[PDB]
Structure formats: C-alpha cells, structure tokens
Amino acid sequence: MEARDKQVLRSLRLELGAEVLVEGLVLQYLYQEGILTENHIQEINAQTTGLRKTMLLLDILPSRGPKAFDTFLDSLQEFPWVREKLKKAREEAMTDLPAG
C-alpha cells in the first residue's frame, strides 16, 4: 500500500532527474498548492543552477510529500512528455504483487 507514489518518484526521479527541464512554472503551482513547504524552500531555493529545482521535487516527494504526486504532475511544465513518462513510472515503478 504505502509504496505507490514514492515508488514512482524514485524511479522517474533519477531518470528525468539527470536532465529534462531547466525552467518553467511548475513547483510554483506546487509550493502553493501545498506540495512543498518551508522545508522545500530551503531545497528549492538551494538549486543555484536550474536543473536542481526539478531534482528537488523528486528529492522532496520521496521524503516530504505523501500525495504530492498527482499535484506535482499537474505542474509538469512539460507534462505531454514528463507526465506520461511519469504516470508510466507510477504504473511501472509502483511495486506490483502480480507477475504475468
């Protein structure tokens, strides 16, 4: 049960985390919606480059954010390709019981 959203994060976390976005309204809808928090502020304000911001969510959701995904995706400045590949990892990254 408690390993579906966090599983997605980690997965696509490193994937798109390596390099995908460098700017675009995203964590703004989040930080506001609640996805984030003061704690994030520190991490998000920490980037110092641009690609970090992304890593951030991917770095926060896994620790600070139980149901921040659905919303963290609603931000996906590039959803068309980031959201798909994401929810894809929600279906894939999410440890499944079945097998075949």
Swiss-Prot record:
Outcome after substituting L27F: Loss of interaction with CASP2
Molecular function terms from GO: death domain binding; protease binding; protein-macromolecule adaptor activity
Signal peptide, first to last residue: none
One cellular component term from this protein's GO annotations in UniProt: cytosol
GO BP terms, alphabetized: apoptotic signaling pathway; cellular response to mechanical stimulus; DNA damage response; DNA damage response, signal transduction by p53 class mediator; extrinsic apoptotic signaling pathway via death domain receptors; positive regulation of apoptotic process; positive regulation of apoptotic signaling pathway
Positions of the CARD domain: 1-91
Taxonomy, superkingdom: Eukaryota
Residue ranges the record marks as coiled coil: none
Cell location: Cytoplasm; Nucleus
Keywords: Apoptosis, Cytoplasm, Disease variant, Intellectual disability, Lissencephaly, Nucleus
Expression across tissues: Constitutively expressed in most tissues, with particularly high expression in adult heart, testis, liver, skeletal muscle, fetal liver and kidney.
Domain comment as written in the entry: The Death domain mediates the interaction with PIDD1 and the formation of a complex composed of 5 PIDD1 and 7 CRADD proteins which in turn probably recruit 7 CASP2 to form the PIDDosome. The Death domain mediates a direct interaction with the Death domain of RIPK1.
Assembly notes: Forms a complex named the PIDDosome with PIDD1 and CASP2. Interacts (via Death domain) with RIPK1 (via Death domain); the interaction is direct. Interacts with TRADD. Interacts with TNFRSF1A.
Biological role stated in the UniProt entry: Adapter protein that associates with PIDD1 and the caspase CASP2 to form the PIDDosome, a complex that activates CASP2 and triggers apoptosis. Also recruits CASP2 to the TNFR-1 signaling complex through its interaction with RIPK1 and TRADD and may play a role in the tumor necrosis factor-mediated signaling pathway.
Disease (UniProt): Intellectual developmental disorder, autosomal recessive 34, with variant lissencephaly: A disorder characterized by mild to moderate intellectual disability, megalencephaly or enlarged head circumference, and a mild variant of lissencephaly with anterior-predominant pachygyria with shallow and unusually wide sulci and mildly thickened cortex. Some patients may have seizures.
Name of the protein this chain belongs to: Death domain-containing protein CRADD
Organism: Homo sapiens
Gene name linked to the record: CRADD
Section covered of the full-length record: 1 to 100 of 199
